[PDB]
Design a binder for this molecule. Structure first.
Ligand code: CLA
Ligand code: CLA
Ligand code: CLA
Ligand code: CLA
Ligand code: CLA
Ligand code: CLA
Ligand code: CLA
Ligand code: CLA
Ligand SMILES: CCCCCCCCCCCCCCCCCCCC(=O)O[C@H](COC(=O)CCCCCCCCCCCCCC)COP(=O)(O)OCCN
Ligand SMILES: CCCCCCCCCCCCO[C@H]1O[C@H](CO)[C@@H](O[C@H]2O[C@H](CO)[C@@H](O)[C@H](O)[C@H]2O)[C@H](O)[C@H]1O
Ligand SMILES: CC1=C(C/C=C(\C)CCC[C@H](C)CCC[C@H](C)CCCC(C)C)C(=O)c2ccccc2C1=O
Lengths: 165, 734, 107, 143, 41, 107, 107
């Protein structure tokens, strides 16, 4: 009941939206014979709509004055009101995947800059090396913070090209 | 060559081309680049130009007063501040037709008039002006003020009266005087006028110059001021059932803190405004004895800048050497002033609509919309000017040997980090805002709108709950009686502030949903991206990896040619000219949000904005397409309504936008070759080669191309949005 | 005159199955505006078997054209004198590429 | 060169019809440029002011309204046939000024006779800031 | 073969392979888990 | 190439003249509509700039099977004139009238 | 043209949501996006983007993730080509979506 938002299970406009979608799906369904492929496709669409409307309920979702679900944003408020999985956990998973991609790219750049003509390796990928680094990045945050600790993650400003003042 | 028109530029005088005119107009007030001139002459020209700009301001407001008093309905609006629309000025167009004259006769006038959206009617009714003769004498008084400002501009430029160079550089005395006199005693005089005139005029008592010095502002009569019994002024405030024009429900209170709004007119109380300006006056006068004048006490600005260096090398040399940097560079002070005035203008826009200071202003929807749009566009333009003149400071007058190791040298040292982090936050905001908007649009397109991502603005909702809004729930400050903030002053302004903030009719802390949060994040994206462009221009103004010697090429140069891969739009001026586009887009976003939210609030269909601002098709259809029906129907083969001029200037703005595209897409060479062919055609024809041009026709310069395209773009943008805004807010509301 | 022409069917994945509109005739799909239905009606095509055979023949001819490009570049590349015979090119194009094609379509 | 050649207006023009990108009213009011060369044989070249012309075997004289057209024709003749032409500038009063081979050996060579002007004896980027030269009329690169 | 393998080792081919793999993974996830919005089991 | 400057200059002049006497006509109509002068417009009712040449060609081609193509049973198209051909209750092809707006958009 | 052709129509495009025509409206909005996205390739230049790329290069060099292939801004001809291509694509797709949605919903 936070932010003046009713839960989707106890909401009123949520049910109106569900009935409206089921009504237009049934209106589209009534134009076809029961033993037809469009009938089966529309029945599958109606079943998916009902399952989505049921699964959006009984999960702590809140909607305000329109039946459209709202996402609780602040952690702590989301943690104490069963809304952590709305945005708190998805950004944790996204940060994991984004750090995976960044660490794999960093490892490929560092390992490809060692050999002669690194631009050829950049534009013609070493597929076994890329796949080896792809399956070795499952522990990207530990490795990243350890390179931060030993200083190999950062480059000294004396060795970095600097625009004139 | 050596023509007399560019008298401030010998090099422009010996220019046998039409560009000599154009560069003779654009470089008119760039005195630093004028040949054979010194700093003292530049400062005197600055003083004279300031006097002229002031005289023009006073002439414009005097003309507004005269054109309201003459051919206006100020007295009729005073009698009925709800029904009859204000009149700006009469229309005398000989190109008009009879249906045009009949359609433009509004507000009980004898001819075609323009409905005023400036808000001078509400302002002048609030400050106590009631009759047309008062507006007439105010207009002639302001014309006289402009005349004596012309006298000042002429006289202070005369020999033996020109101020010395160090006189303008007296920063401490100027700060002290403009804090004490320009701000303090000016506000004291304003609140004295408020107490003497506007509060009695809002209480049905006429206080003019004829009956001045004989009507007591307060029944106690200035003895509470001497005795310190200042609570006697806040004793009998105006009741809720008080008429603004009459004395019914009146009270005897000149200074009070009655928070909220006047129930009859939905505006701030006159006694509240008088108390506000009095407190501002005493605080400014107190703050205006800080700096070291010729007397033995005060503060030296240079010494304060020297002393505020953090230990352990946190800011390096600190703020040392900055006093001469600010004082020597006019562009540093210009950028600081324009930035502060733009921030203040944005504050004025964000606070006038939520807290209407003028009587019967909240009911006038078109007036509030036009005022907000005007203030936000002016604020954005002058923030862009602030950053541009900061870049001009970095190019023209910046000595690294003077301020070595200070904050300026440090932000020049890690300018790449600042630009990169600003680019990162801009990319993040734009990527995810567009991703969410496209996701919501696709979800709504598929017929199942519940799949859309709606993040509730819990931060701003919690802030508003902490300030009195109980609709979001919570148990924060100003919403629970047990909180110390609620208990403090619970009989001072909370009984009015909570009443004003718990009502959904006014614009004070409106209810915000996920669409409001999305558009606010888009506004943050616009601000961050415009800032990124402007600080990339300013920090790389004097040098870059592509152009190390950008300081030697000045502030506004076209390019360096096709060498080194291509170098077009590398100056800080071009970065400013791109940031003008981005600022126009940002202010367009904020004005779209304001206009749609307020239109849905005035219509009562706030749920339409709540469920329609989520996806961009709702913005295109329910706002841009739905509200444009009355605008485009201003004139048609069927007939004409009063919004014909707004339709015409809407098409006008679209056309000037198109001409901006004309000047922006093509750059120079096609036009130079076309002008060459036209020159041959004119030279090799009979009956027309007798008349010849004195100045050779040439294509406009690339910098001039950007300037003209930007000017047409901005004019079309402003005219189009003003037309749509005023037409939509006036075709269905009054 | 009552069923809209439709020749594109989408996969139900993320709610895009609503794009398979009720075009008529007990079918769901995107209403096409290319006019291929009218072209096939003008060509005498009745069943889907003829469309299948035309698709197979078009794939065979496309493979033949790709083989022709590979062959006439890598294997048997015509010389400059072969390309410069503009009179022969014009005669063959006017008689066989356009005239014989028009006669075959008329037949 | 050893002796500066003088412009001869009586030298024949190359075989060419009418011109449209040729001389405008600037020729009779301001300066106009004249390119001369010595063709060893009859050959067809392309003018920078239009189509194609045929130069006569012997002295050839052409007129242009811009020095860039003269140098474009000069470099076309030098790259195509190694012609070594030269152009003069004629003012409204008839003053003739020798322009391209000032020492007669072309500016690609040195000849050990020219004096280097407009040269800065400091490295680029060592110039002073614009604050150092303010209200003086002197640019940072002009010192 | 190794010339063909280096051709597939070029950037557009591996980009197409990655795009096909990621699109197929996301499409099969969305098909076998219809309309995922709330992280619950 | 030798008279490209004259070509480009004359083309530029005719482009300017066409742009003026078409778009300025449109702006003139917009202004005099917004000024409350429907009789001052370049419309089909106020100032008739009818396409007389196009109308004459339409009338001639409508009478092409009558005298100049006597073996044609009807007109080569229904855009010139005649009856209205409709299929399924929807208009297949009907005669097209050309007026002041048609002249304006064609120019 | 603004009201009786562009505003009287295009109501089907914006109201296509929840129907089979909605993708057209989606494309319509996307087309507007592409038509806007071209403009800064048509405006601006190369030095600004080159300096921004230099700052980004500094950022990637601080983290030692600077590419061996040096990133550069698009060429002036390349920028003009990208701008005209995205502008034409946005305009053609806008007209395509608006035309098809209007002519399918009421046609
Ligand atoms: C509405 C049109 C539009 C859009 C979307 C952009 C977008 C962008 N501009 Mg531009 N700009 C525009 C018009 C536009 N501009 C115009 C008219 C001008 C005036 C000339 C400028 C002037 C300008 C300047 C001066 C600067 C920018 C910058 C930027 C970036 C801002 C960062 C951001 O918001 O995150 C990115 C957000 C986006 C919406 C980018 C589009 C990416 C979307 C998501 C599509 C991604 C691909 C997608 C998966 C499809 C793949 C297939 C497809 C490629 C076929 C971004 C690339 C700044 C920059 O470079 O950032 C560092 C910068 O310095 N622009
Ligand atoms: C900087 C952004 C930001 C903002 C504006 C908020 C805002 C809020 N948080 Mg949150 N918070 C944040 C980041 C933020 N949070 C982060 C990063 C964490 C760590 C995961 C938390 C952990 C947190 C807890 C544990 C709690 C809040 C609570 C609150 C609310 C009241 C806070 C207060 O002082 O009273 C308010 C809605 C409180 C709440 O639920 O309010 C009732 C609460 O108990 N926050
Ligand atoms: C994997 C390589 C890699 C890494 C580690 C980084 C890291 C960084 N970039 Mg960079 N970037 C990259 C590739 C990379 N970038 C590419 C390919 C481009 C061209 C599109 C850019 C364009 C770019 C800009 C324009 C900006 C950054 C910025 C940043 C910083 C912010 C973090 C971030 O996610 O930015 C967001 C980064 C992106 C949106 C780029 C994503 C590009 C693709 C999708 C990722 C490529 C992955 C790669 C192919 C994996 C190779 C693996 C190998 C085995 C084949 C950070 C230092 C910002 C900055 O300066 O912050 C301080 C900034 O403004 N980057
Ligand atoms: C406190 C206000 C203030 C002050 C004192 C200055 C003063 C100055 N600025 Mg700054 N500036 C300001 C605000 C200010 N500006 C703002 C708000 C902007 C953002 C728009 C700028 C942007 C800016 C740039 C980008 C540059 C300056 C420059 C200059 C100098 C040249 C002025 C001059 O004599 O030429 C007189 C100039 C003109 C007469 C040109 C005005 C043309 C305008 C745009 C036309 C009006 C638009 C439209 C057509 C009006 C008709 C509307 C239509 C519907 C009828 C001077 C030092 C230049 C400079 O220092 O040179 C290096 C420079 O490059 N300024
Ligand atoms: C106490 C004595 C005193 C006073 C009253 C002034 C007054 C003024 N001087 Mg100053 N000056 C003084 C002493 C003084 N001077 C001394 C001693 C020196 C030498 C050291 C100078 C040196 C000096 C210079 C060098 C210049 C001035 C200028 C000015 C003008 C500033 C612009 C203006 O009108 O403000 C207008 C602004 C305000 C009144 C307030 C600022 C606005 C903020 C945001 C508050 C807004 C209030 C409210 C919300 C809005 C109300 C209006 C709305 C309802 C419509 C003003 C006339 C300038 C000039 O020539 O004129 C332009 C100028 O260039 N002065
Ligand atoms: C009457 C004989 C004849 C015919 C029918 C054609 C037909 C064609 N020629 Mg060709 N040509 C001919 C003689 C002929 N040529 C001669 C004698 C010369 C030398 C002077 C050339 C030189 C020539 C050049 C230089 C080019 C063509 C091209 C083309 C194609 C034009 C594209 C088109 O209309 O698509 C119509 C497409 C179809 C109808 C699809 C089916 C196409 C089939 C497979 C071709 C069958 C005709 C073929 C000539 C039969 C003999 C080939 C046999 C040895 C297997 C077309 C396939 C262009 C090309 O390369 O296109 C690929 C091209 O650039 N022609
Ligand atoms: C809709 C937008 C628009 C408009 C109106 C123009 C207008 C113009 N461009 Mg441009 N063009 C544009 C966008 C636009 N451009 C863009 C974006 C590009 C980039 C690709 C180009 C590329 C381009 C090229 C490549 C060429 C042009 C040319 C022209 C001219 C058209 C010829 C003509 O008859 O004009 C007539 C003038 C108009 C149509 C403007 C409106 C006139 C109205 C009716 C006012 C009438 C006079 C008025 C009453 C007097 C006002 C009085 C006042 C001063 C008090 C004209 C100056 C051509 C040119 O130079 O001339 C041939 C040319 O070669 N343009
Ligand atoms: C706007 C131009 C225009 C167009 C498109 C048409 C189109 C048509 N008219 Mg009309 N016509 C026009 C102007 C036009 N007309 C002006 C007049 C008044 C003199 C007429 C008088 C007229 C009559 C009296 C009749 C028509 C008929 C027709 C039809 C067939 C005509 C035919 O066989 O052409 C020839 C068809 C071709 C496909 C030939 C095209 C050849 C191509 C373009 C290459 C040409 C190169 C050329 C030979 C080289 C130049 C040589 C030169 C240097 C000497 C057709 C609908 C007839 C009708 O009623 O319809 C059945 C009919 O009886 N027209
Ligand atoms: C660190 C994050 C701690 C989260 C603790 C959540 C405890 C409650 C819990 O597990 O119940 C829900 C079950 O969801 C699940 O499906 C289990 C999620 C397990 C979360 C910890 C890993 C999770 O919360 P919810 O699914 O009701 O949240 C709204 C969606 N965001
Ligand atoms: C909200 C908080 C935001 C904090 C943002 C970062 C602040 C500090 C910036 O400093 C950033 O660069 C410095 C200079 O390379 C590093 O400084 C140092 O780092 C390590 C020791 O801690 C050493 O291995 C490095 O050689 C040393 O340079 C800092 O460890 C790093 O964090
Ligand atoms: C923005 C801009 C740039 C900067 C843009 C550049 C350098 C091109 C950037 C191209 C990117 C790398 C294309 C690929 C974008 C995405 C990484 C690909 C899609 C990713 C998803 C599928 C995940 C210029 O260089 C320029 C040059 C000349 C005139 C105008 C401009 C101009 O406007």
């Amino acid at each position: 009941d936070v932010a003046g938002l009713t839960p989707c299970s106890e909401s009123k406009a949520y049910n109106k939206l569900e009935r409206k979608e089921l009504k237009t799906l049934e209106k589209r369904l009534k134009k076809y014979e029961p033993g037809s492929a469009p009938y089966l496709a529309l029945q599958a669409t109606k079943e998916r709509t009902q399952n989505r409307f049921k699964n959006y309920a009984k999960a702590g979702l809140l909607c305000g004055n329109d039946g459209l679900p709202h996402l609780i944003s602040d952690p702590g408020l989301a943690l104490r009101f069963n809304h952590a999985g709305e945005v708190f956990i998805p950004t944790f998973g996204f940060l994991y995947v984004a750090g995976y991609i960044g660490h794999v790219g960093r490892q490929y750049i560092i390992k490809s800059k060692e050999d002669a003509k690194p631009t050829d390796k950049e534009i013609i990928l070493d597929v076994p090396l890329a796949l080896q680094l792809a399956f070795q990045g499952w522990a990207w945050p530990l490795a990243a913070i350890q390179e931060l600790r030993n200083g190999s993650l950062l480059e000294k400003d004396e060795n970095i090209t600097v625009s004139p003042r | 060559a050596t023509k007399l028109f560019p008298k401030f530029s010998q090099g422009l005088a010996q220019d046998p081309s039409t560009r000599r005119i154009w560069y003779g107009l654009a470089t008119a007030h760039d005195f630093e680049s004028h040949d054979g001139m010194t700093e003292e002459n530049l400062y005197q020209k600055i003083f004279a130009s300031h006097f002229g700009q002031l005289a023009i301001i006073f002439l414009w407001t005097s003309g507004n007063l005269f054109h309201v008093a003459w051919q206006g309905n100020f007295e009729q609006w005073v009698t009925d501040p709800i029904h009859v629309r204000p009149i700006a000025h009469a229309i005398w167009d000989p190109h008009f037709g009879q249906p045009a004259v009949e359609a433009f006769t509004r507000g009980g006038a004898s001819g075609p008039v323009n409905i005023a959206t400036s808000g001078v009617y509400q302002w002048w009714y609030t400050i106590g002006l009631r009759s047309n003769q008062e507006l007439y004498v105010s207009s002639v008084f302001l014309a006289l003020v402009s005349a004596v400002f012309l006298f000042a501009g002429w006289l202070h430029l005369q020999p033996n009266f020109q101020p010395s160079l160090s006189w303008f550089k007296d920063a401490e005395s100027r700060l002290n005087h403009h804090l004490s006199g320009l701000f303090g005693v000016s506000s004291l005089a304003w609140t004295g006028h408020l107490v003497h005139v506007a509060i009695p005029e809002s209480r049905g008592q006429h206080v003019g110059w004829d009956n001045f010095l004989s009507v007591l502002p307060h029944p106690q009569g200035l003895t509470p001021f001497w005795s310190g019994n200042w609570a006697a002024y806040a004793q009998n405030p105006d009741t809720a059932s008080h008429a603004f024009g009459t004395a019914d429900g009146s009270g005897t209170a000149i200074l009070t803190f009655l928070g909220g709004f006047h129930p009859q007119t939905q505006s701030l109380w006159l006694s509240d405004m008088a108390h506000h300006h009095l407190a501002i006056a005493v605080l400014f006068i107190v703050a205006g004895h800080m700096y070291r004048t010729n007397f033995g006490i005060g503060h030296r600005l240079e010494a304060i800048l020297e002393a505020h260096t953090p230990p352990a090398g946190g800011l390096g040399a600190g703020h040392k050497g900055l006093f001469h940097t600010v004082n020597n560079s006019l562009h540093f002070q210009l950028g600081l002033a324009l930035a502060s005035v733009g921030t203040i203008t944005s504050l004025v826009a964000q606070h006038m609509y939520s807290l209407p200071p003028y009587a019967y202003l909240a009911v006038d929807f078109t007036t509030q919309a036009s005022l907000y749009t005007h203030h936000q566009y002016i604020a954005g333009f002058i923030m862009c000017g602030a950053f541009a003149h900061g870049a001009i400071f970095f190019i023209r007058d910046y000595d690294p040997e003077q301020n070595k190791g200070n904050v300026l040298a440090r932000v020049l040292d890690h300018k790449e980090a600042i630009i990169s982090h600003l680019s990162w936050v801009s990319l993040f905001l734009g990527f995810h805002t567009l991703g969410l908007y496209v996701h919501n649009d696709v979800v709504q397109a598929f017929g199942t709108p519940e799949k859309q991502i709606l993040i509730e603005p819990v931060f701003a909702q919690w802030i508003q709950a902490a300030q009195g809004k109980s609709l979001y729930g919570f148990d924060l400050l100003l919403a629970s009686s047990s909180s110390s903030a609620y208990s403090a002053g619970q009989s001072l302004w909370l009984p009015g502030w909570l009443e004003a903030i718990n009502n959904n009719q006014n614009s004070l802390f409106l209810t915000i949903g996920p669409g409001d949060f999305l558009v606010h994040h888009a506004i943050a994206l616009g601000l961050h991206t415009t800032t990124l462009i402007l600080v990339k221009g300013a920090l790389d103004a004097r040098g870059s990896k592509l152009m190390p010697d950008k300081k030697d090429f000045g502030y506004s140069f076209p390019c360096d040619g096709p060498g080194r891969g291509g170098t077009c739009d590398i100056s800080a001026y071009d970065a400013f000219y791109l940031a003008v586009f981005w600022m126009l887009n940002t202010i367009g976003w904020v004005t779209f949000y304001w206009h749609w939210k307020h239109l849905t609030l005035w219509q009562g269909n706030v749920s339409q904005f709540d469920e329609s601002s989520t996806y961009l098709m709702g913005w295109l259809r329910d706002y841009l397409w739905l509200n444009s029906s009355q605008l485009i129907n201003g004139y048609n083969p069927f007939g004409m309504n009063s919004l014909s001029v707004w339709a015409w200037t809407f098409l006008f703005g679209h056309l000037v936008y198109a001409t901006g595209f004309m000047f922006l897409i093509s750059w120079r060479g096609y036009w130079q070759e076309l002008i060459e062919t036209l020159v041959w055609a004119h030279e090799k024809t009979p009956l027309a080669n007798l008349v010849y041009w004195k100045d050779k026709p040439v294509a406009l310069s690339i910098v001039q191309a950007r300037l003209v395209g930007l000017a047409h773009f901005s004019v079309g943008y402003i005219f189009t949005y003003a037309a749509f805004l005023i037409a939509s807010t006036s075709g269905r509301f009054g | 005159t009552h069923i809209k022409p439709s020749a594109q069917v989408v996969w139900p994945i993320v709610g895009q199955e609503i794009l398979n509109g009720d075009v008529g005739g007990g079918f769901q799909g995107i209403q096409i505006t290319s006019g291929f239905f009218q072209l096939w009606r003008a060509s005498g095509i009745t069943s889907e078997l003829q469309l299948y055979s035309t698709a197979i023949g078009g794939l065979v001819l496309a493979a033949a054209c790709f083989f022709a490009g590979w062959f006439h570049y890598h294997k048997a590349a015509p010389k400059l004198e072969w390309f410069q015979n503009v009179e022969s090119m014009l005669n063959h194009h006017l008689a066989g590429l356009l005239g014989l094609g028009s006669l075959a379509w008329a037949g | 060169p050893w002796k500066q050649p003088e412009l001869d207006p009586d030298t024949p023009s190359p075989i060419f019809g009418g011109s449209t990108g040729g001389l405008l009213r600037k020729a009779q009011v301001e300066e106009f440029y004249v390119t001369t060369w010595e063709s060893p044989k009859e050959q067809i070249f392309e003018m920078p002011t239009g189509g194609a012309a045929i130069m006569r075997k012997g002295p050839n004289l052409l007129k242009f309204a811009r020095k860039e057209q003269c140098l474009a024709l000069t470099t076309q003749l030098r790259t195509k046939f190694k012609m070594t032409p030269c152009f003069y500038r004629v003012y409204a009063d008839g003053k003739v000024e020798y322009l391209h081979p000032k020492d007669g050996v072309y500016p690609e060579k040195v000849n050990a006779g020219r004096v280097g002007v407009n040269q800065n004896m400091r490295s680029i980027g060592e110039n002073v800031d614009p604050i150092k030269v303010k209200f003086t009329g002197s640019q940072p690169f002009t010192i | 073969m190794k010339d063909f393998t280096t051709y597939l080792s070029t950037a557009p081919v591996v980009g197409l392979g990655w795009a096909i793999f990621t699109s197929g993974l996301l499409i099969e996830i969305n098909r076998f888990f219809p309309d995922p919005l709330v992280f619950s089991f | 190439i030798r008279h490209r400057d004259a070509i480009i200059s004359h083309l530029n002049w005719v482009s300017i003249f066409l742009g003026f006497h078409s778009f300025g006509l449109y702006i003139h109509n917009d202004t005099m509509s917004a000024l409350g002068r429907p009789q001052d417009m370049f419309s089909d009712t106020a100032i008739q700039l009818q396409p007389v040449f196009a109308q004459w060609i339409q009338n001639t081609h409508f009478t092409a099977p009558q005298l100049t193509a006597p073996n044609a049973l009807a007109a080569t198209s229904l855009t010139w004139g005649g009856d209205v051909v409709a299929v399924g209750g929807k208009v297949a092809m009907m005669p097209i009238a050309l007026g002041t707006s048609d002249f304006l958009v064609h120019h | 043209w603004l009201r009786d052709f562009l505003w009287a129509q295009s109501s089907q495009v914006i109201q296509s949501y929840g129907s089979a025509l909605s993708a057209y409206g989606l494309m319509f909005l996307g087309a507007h996006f592409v038509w806007a996205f071209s403009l800064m390739f048509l405006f601006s230049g190369r030095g600004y983007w080159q300096e921004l790329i230099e700052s980004i290069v500094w950022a990637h060099n601080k983290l030692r993730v600077a590419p061996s292939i040096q990133p550069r801004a698009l060429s002036i001809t390349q920028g003009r080509a990208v701008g005209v291509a995205h502008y034409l694509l946005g305009g053609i797709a806008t007209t395509w979506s608006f035309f098809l949605a209007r002519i399918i919903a009421v046609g």
